[PDB]
Amino acid sequence: FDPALTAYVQGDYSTAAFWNGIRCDSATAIFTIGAAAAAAGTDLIAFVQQLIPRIVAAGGTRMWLQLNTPLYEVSSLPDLIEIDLRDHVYRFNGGERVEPYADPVPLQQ
């Protein structure tokens, strides 16, 4: 791929280091943002709390993040996603992967 048009950076964005010298006017964290909160074993709200500000500094005008919050209802799917309420977390295929979530209102504000 033409270097000018496509660039590739290794290492996670969850770690503060990675953000040195990476400026893009728009970021998209779809399919990852949920796994990072789980990988970094951190709270979902607290996670994006440190990511959003990095994208601002990274020089970003737009953002798209596939966050997993029950905005419509706290109701879950029997086989697709279980919503453990004791601890804000999901269970895509109950176990196959577990990723913390936020609430529509708290995460919104």
Partner 1 sequence: PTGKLWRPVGTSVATIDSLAIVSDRFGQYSFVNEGMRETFSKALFDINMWQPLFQATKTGCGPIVLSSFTTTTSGYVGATAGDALDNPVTNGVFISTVQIMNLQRTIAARMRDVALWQKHLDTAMTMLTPDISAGSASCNWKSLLAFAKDILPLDNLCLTYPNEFYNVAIHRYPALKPGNPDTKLPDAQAHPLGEVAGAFNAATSEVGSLVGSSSTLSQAISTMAGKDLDLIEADTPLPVSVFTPSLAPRSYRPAFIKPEDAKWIAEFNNSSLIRKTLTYSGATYTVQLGPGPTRVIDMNAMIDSVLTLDVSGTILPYDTNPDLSTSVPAFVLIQTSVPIQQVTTAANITAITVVSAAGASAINLAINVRGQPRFNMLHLQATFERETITGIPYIYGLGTFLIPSPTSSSNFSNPTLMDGLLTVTPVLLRETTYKGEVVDAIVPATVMANQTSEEVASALANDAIVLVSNHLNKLANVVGDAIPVASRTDDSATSAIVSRLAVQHKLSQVGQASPTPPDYPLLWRRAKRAASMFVSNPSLALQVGIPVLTQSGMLSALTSGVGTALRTGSLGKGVTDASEKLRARQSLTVAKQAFFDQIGSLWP
Q: Which two tokens stand for residue 30?
A: 């779809």
Show the site string, 47-86: x = touches partner 1 by CB under 8 A, - = not.
----------------------------------------
- What stretch of H or E contains 83? none
| 23 forms part of the interface with partner 1 (CB under 8 A) | yes
| 95 forms part of the interface with partner 1 (CB under 8 A) | no
| 5 forms part of the interface with partner 1 (CB under 8 A) | yes
Which of 6, 7, 73, 75 binds partner 1 (CB under 8 A)? It is 7
In sequence order, the β-bridge partners of residue 77 are 81
In sequence order, the β-bridge partners of residue 100 are 89
Q: Which is nearer to partner 1, 3 or 41 (CB)?
A: 3
| 96 forms part of the interface with partner 1 (CB under 8 A) | no
CA separation for the pair 105, 109 (Å, rounded): 6
Close Cβ partners of 50 (under 8 Å, ≥ 6 residues apart): none
| 2 forms part of the interface with partner 1 (CB under 8 A) | yes
Close Cβ partners of 76 (under 8 Å, ≥ 6 residues apart): 82, 83
Q: Which residues bind partner 1 (CB under 8 A)?
A: 2-5, 7, 20-21, 23
